[PDB]
Amino acid sequence: EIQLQQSGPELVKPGTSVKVSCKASGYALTSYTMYWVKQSHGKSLEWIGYIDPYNGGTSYNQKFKGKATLTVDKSSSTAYMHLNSLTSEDSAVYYCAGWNRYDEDWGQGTTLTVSSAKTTPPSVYPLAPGSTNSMVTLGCLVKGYFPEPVTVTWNSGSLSSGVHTFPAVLQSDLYTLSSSVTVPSSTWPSETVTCNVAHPASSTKVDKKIVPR
Amino acid sequence: DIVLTQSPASLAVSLGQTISCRTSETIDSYGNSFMHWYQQKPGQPPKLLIYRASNARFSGSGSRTDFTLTINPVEADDVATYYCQQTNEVMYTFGGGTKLEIKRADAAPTVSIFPPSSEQLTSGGASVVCFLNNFYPKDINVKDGRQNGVLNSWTDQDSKDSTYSMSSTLTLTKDEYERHNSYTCEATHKTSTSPIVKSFNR
Numbered sequence A: 001e002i003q004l005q006q007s008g009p010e011l012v013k014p015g016t017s018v019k020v021s022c023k024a025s026g027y028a029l030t031s032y033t034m035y036w037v038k039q040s041h042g043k044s045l046e047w048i049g050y051i052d053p054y055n056g057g058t059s060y061n062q063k064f065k066g067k068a069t070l071t072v073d074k075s076s077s078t079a080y081m082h083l084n085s086l087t088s089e090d091s092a093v094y095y096c097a098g099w100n101r102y103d104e105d106w107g108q109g110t111t112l113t114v115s116s117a118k119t120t121p122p123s124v125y126p127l128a129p130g131s132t133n134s135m136v137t138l139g140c141l142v143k144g145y146f147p148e149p150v151t152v153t154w155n156s157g158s159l160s161s162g163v164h165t166f167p168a169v170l171q172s173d174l175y176t177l178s179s180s181v182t183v184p185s186s187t188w189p190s191e192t193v194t195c196n197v198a199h200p201a202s203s204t205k206v207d208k209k210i211v212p213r
Numbered sequence B: 001d002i003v004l005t006q007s008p009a010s011l012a013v014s015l016g017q018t019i020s021c022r023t024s025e026t027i028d029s030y031g032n033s034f035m036h037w038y039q040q041k042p043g044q045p046p047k048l049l050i051y052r053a054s055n056a057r058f059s060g061s062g063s064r065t066d067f068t069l070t071i072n073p074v075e076a077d078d079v080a081t082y083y084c085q086q087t088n089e090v091m092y093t094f095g096g097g098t099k100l101e102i103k104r105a106d107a108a109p110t111v112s113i114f115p116p117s118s119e120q121l122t123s124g125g126a127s128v129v130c131f132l133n134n135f136y137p138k139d140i141n142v143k144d145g146r147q148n149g150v151l152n153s154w155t156d157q158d159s160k161d162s163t164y165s166m167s168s169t170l171t172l173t174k175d176e177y178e179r180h181n182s183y184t185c186e187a188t189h190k191t192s193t194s195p196i197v198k199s200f201n202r
């Protein structure tokens, strides 16, 4: 009965304030209570606070009293979470959820990065193997981008389940990740295999055909 | 306050083959108090499973102070971290979460080595990549005959075949890369008594 769409990822400087949005759609939307969760990279979920869109009731985690301000905009069916006095400890994934007795939906998460570093596009480098078997594993390397998230598809998503995208790793203040696609060697290099890299932070989308040599 | 505590932090069962959550404040003391159990698959939002109120594949058990999620049977899709949560007008709170692992027969890693792109070489750098893919268990070690500038990255247990895959990278300057010739990536896994190795000349 309800579906939720959070705003895009974000890079902001310490000591400013963001507002992230959650656009609801569905039936009987004031019947759902909106709330917000923080998930730090590889950490557990912590509740931020709630807002009852029908009556305006709100209740916050003590730790975010003062920090976070939840509002809803019944007109545009949008919940907001405003965050002040931002620091590096705040950067994490922020979910928005809605629920009642009958069902419950979460949003897709919003990656927020607090840093005074500037955005850095990825370096997308193809990985072709050397010189035997029906399967051939290709790859693609995205080198030194900031911040994270980054979206990596193969052939615009036409290749899946043959994929292994590896969690980016922080080395020298930057992220780098690799992803392996495996296909029949019947198919490659006859059929053109392409790496797709979206870095929404640096508003970047690059395709790199893998080529045989 | 309200403290949610769940045992165990880490779990590991095989296909075909319970998690407890204990509140410090009972659900029954508030008029509209709720307990939830969530499944979080990796790189996904958490999804609601079961709920309990005050006054099929998965089931909730226990007393009004212990909401017990019980998965039976375990599919390979059930690989995730599981969270319990308590609801009332004063606060929401979540448990620590419990990581679920699938038990599978040990598997040979499929190793493939890769040389620097010409695009990275014209940039002035050179990176050597080794995918070890689809190997059980997670335990694995990797290494002209350096250990500096290496970067590794594991994957979570696969949801289809209950497997792990690892990526490693050895990185040099343009000029330092040609100072050597044979580059061999050595894969020390448990099951293969021989250390699976692959190399390239140029």
Ligand SMILES: [Cl-]
Pocket (backbone or CB within 6 Å): A171, A172, A173
């Ligand atoms: Cl560092």
